Write a protein that binds this DNA or RNA. Structure first.
Ligand SMILES: [Zn+2]
Lengths: 69, 89, 135, 114
RNA sequence: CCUCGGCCGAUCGAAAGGGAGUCGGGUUCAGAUCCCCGAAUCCGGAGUGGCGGAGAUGGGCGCCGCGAGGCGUCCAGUGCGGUAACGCGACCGAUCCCGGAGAAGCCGGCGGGAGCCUCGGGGAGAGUUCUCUUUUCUUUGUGAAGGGCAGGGCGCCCUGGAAUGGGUUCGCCCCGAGAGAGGGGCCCGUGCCUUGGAAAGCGUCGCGGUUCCGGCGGCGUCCGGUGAGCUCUCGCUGGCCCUUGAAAAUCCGGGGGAGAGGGUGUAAAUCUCGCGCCGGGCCGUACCCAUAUCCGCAGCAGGUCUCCAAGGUGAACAGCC
RNA sequence: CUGGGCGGCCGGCGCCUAGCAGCCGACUUAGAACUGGUGCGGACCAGGGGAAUCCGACUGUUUAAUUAAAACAAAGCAUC
């Protein structure tokens, strides 16, 4: 598993043709966006809910999205 | 601590007094550290029989079984120098 | 007396260019506040030209007569002074101590020492400076 | 106190059966089999007792999946010789060659004058 | 057809020697690091370039462009930084040569890390309450592989020049062949945080359907202190030896420079860097492992190689509970 | 272990100096009083000793299934 610290890098990873799904998890302190690729599961940790809702809207179309509720 | 046994006190009474006395001289010389003639530091220990090593300049020298220099070696080295000098001059 | 004058050939004892031959451009026997030890700015050869024989063509000789250079400051303790001396007129305004703060200027100092060395190499003088030390 | 068992069919405390204790997310203690400790390269000079610097101490077969920078130092005789003996051979090569030129000149001048 | 070229000879020989690379959770009547879920990894292949990044895109002479920035010509460019130790994501190269790792005894003494034990509190459940005891018992996680930081080690470097000798260990031991002091560098990092990760596991309290839903939900999975303690492991440093404690596959680094590439393109050869695509065949695997699955005519007080190892007493892996 | 004249600090103005104050902590040793029907390493664990003689120097080994010994080996000595 790889940890990505930039939103721009996360969008690049999500738009890879290798990417299979985006799993959003909500915790008590942060929201984690996980993109599953061939080799690594890339996780982005966001501590602001305002930026979290923005990322959901900007997620690439067609890519499967699962909410871990 | 001891009167006369010295280093061969590790053998107790287990061998003869004369055998312990003879090995006393050899065991002192075989475990002593000598001054290295190459670097000048007193670190010339014995690796094995006939092998002497310096732990500072990392020089290994062929020497005696228990002493660094045998008397036969010193005489031969001095004699070879005399024979070489006679050949040259 | 002193012998670490400009023009002397030195052997680099440490670093990347360990074993390479260089020439003292400027010498600072005292300590600058930046570096309190004695040091010298040198220009040297990173890649020596390859040997050329009468059997090679002109294009091959030209391609094999190319020099890669380096410009550095060295502690004297990392230099081995040599009796040999090379008087190449390196432009002092291009080869300076200030060349190290700016990458662009470093390329200028590298290119100038490169060009001068190629001219001196082709003329056949200072044969020792352009041979690679075999160690 | 929980007691452990081997995870493999080798029941002997050999050099290839070394293990360590790890606590799992299931709150259980299990054995993890450990790799042998690697050693960094020893200098080609033959006189330096210590290992070389700047090279990873790994087992030899893993060495082929590392990059070259992890296996060498940026210097002549980089990942095979120490800096101290590389310095000594630069000076030893230069000074012996200097003596050879001096000897040749001395014997040439002596021959010419005699 | 030239050039190179020693097999210092076939082959067999270890389910405890060497030998790349997997670990958490769940699942059976009986399997499981092998099945399912999840997260990784090694080796091999990719020719007809899989995509990026690197190589590798500068300088001089002028002209136009208000000037920026473009047109022509010429010359470079097989990377770069640090005084150094060495560092950075790659950073061409054959025959040949040198070296390393694999690859080394036994014993002792110290130190680091972990597991276990211990002590003080906070939760949840349970036991006792004839009298006391704010008590007694249980339980109170974060795999590999990456990233960062502690911590340990260093005969690694730079300044500098020490006697009124100093530094220092339990012991030693160290220094003009460079002490102490200051500042750096490297290796290991099994520890901590982090991605994995709480979604899972466990504890406890409830609500469902029906024999099973990895059902659903609430709360929690906390804060500290100790030590010549035991075990494992990593280090450092010694003692002993007329005893010096494997070999080979396999992998890597260096020396050299025979070669290859392209003339200024937005380019070439090349790349041990990042990601992407395909594959990994054959055999073993149940269970006993012994006062009943083995040998001794048997369920025979005999024999048969190992691993883990709690509390109290106490020198103890003694005996006793 | 920490400290030494809202938060800092430009400063003479302070002087920690028979090591002072506060906080933290584990394991022992020695001495004393008292006390029991002198019983207490209370179980468990756990050498009887001395004077001599013979043989072998010692450690080691041996007839598995009647002999563990003074037998064998051993270092040392000597000979070929
Ligand atoms: Zn010496």
């Amino acid at each position: 598993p790889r940890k990505i610290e930039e939103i721009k890098d996360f969008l690049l990873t999500a738009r890879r043709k290798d990417a299979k799904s985006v799993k959003i998890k909500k915790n008590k302190d942060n929201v984690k966006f996980k993109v599953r690729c061939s080799r690594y599961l890339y996780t982005l940790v966001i501590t602001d809910k305002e930026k979290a809702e923005k990322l959901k809207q900007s997620l690439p179309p067609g890519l499967a999205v699962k909410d871990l509720k | 601590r001891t009167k006369k046994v010295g280093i061969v006190g590790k053998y107790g009474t287990r061998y003869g007094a004369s055998l312990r006395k003879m090995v006393k001289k050899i065991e002192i010389s075989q475990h002593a550290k000598y001054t290295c003639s190459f670097c000048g530091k007193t670190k010339m220990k014995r690796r094995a029989v006939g092998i002497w090593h310096c732990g500072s300049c990392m020089k290994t020298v062929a020497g005696g079984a228990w002493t660094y220099n045998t008397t036969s070696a010193v005489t031969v080295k001095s004699a070879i120098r005399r024979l070489k000098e006679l050949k040259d001059q | 007396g002193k012998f670490m004058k400009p023009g002397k050939v030195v052997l680099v004892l440490a670093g990347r260019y360990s074993g390479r031959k260089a020439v003292i451009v400027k010498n600072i026997d005292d300590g600058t506040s930046d570096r309190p030890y004695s040091h010298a700015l040198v220009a040297g050869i990173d890649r020596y030209p390859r040997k050329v024989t009468a059997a090679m063509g002109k294009k091959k000789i030209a391609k094999r007569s190319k020099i890669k250079s380096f410009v550095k400051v060295y502690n004297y303790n990392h230099l081995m002074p040599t009796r040999y001396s090379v008087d190449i007129p390196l432009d002092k305004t291009v080869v300076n101590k200030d060349v190290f703060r700016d990458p662009a200027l470093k390329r200028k100092a590298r290119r100038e020492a490169k060009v001068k060395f190629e001219e001196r190499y082709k003329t056949g003088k200072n044969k020792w400076f352009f041979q690679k030390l075999r160690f | 106190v929980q007691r452990l068992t081997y995870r493999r069919r080798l029941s002997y405390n050999t050099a290839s059966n070394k293990t360590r204790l790890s606590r799992t997310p299931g709150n259980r203690i299990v054995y993890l089999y450990t790799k042998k400790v690697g050693k960094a390269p020893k200098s080609a000079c033959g006189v330096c007792p210590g290992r070389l610097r700047g090279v990873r101490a790994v087992r030899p077969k893993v060495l082929m999946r590392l990059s070259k920078t992890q296996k060498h130092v940026s210097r002549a005789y980089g990942g095979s010789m120490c800096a101290k003996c590389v310095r000594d051979r630069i000076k030893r090569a230069f000074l012996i060659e200097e003596q050879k030129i001096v000897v040749k000149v001395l014997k040439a001048q002596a021959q010419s004058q005699k």
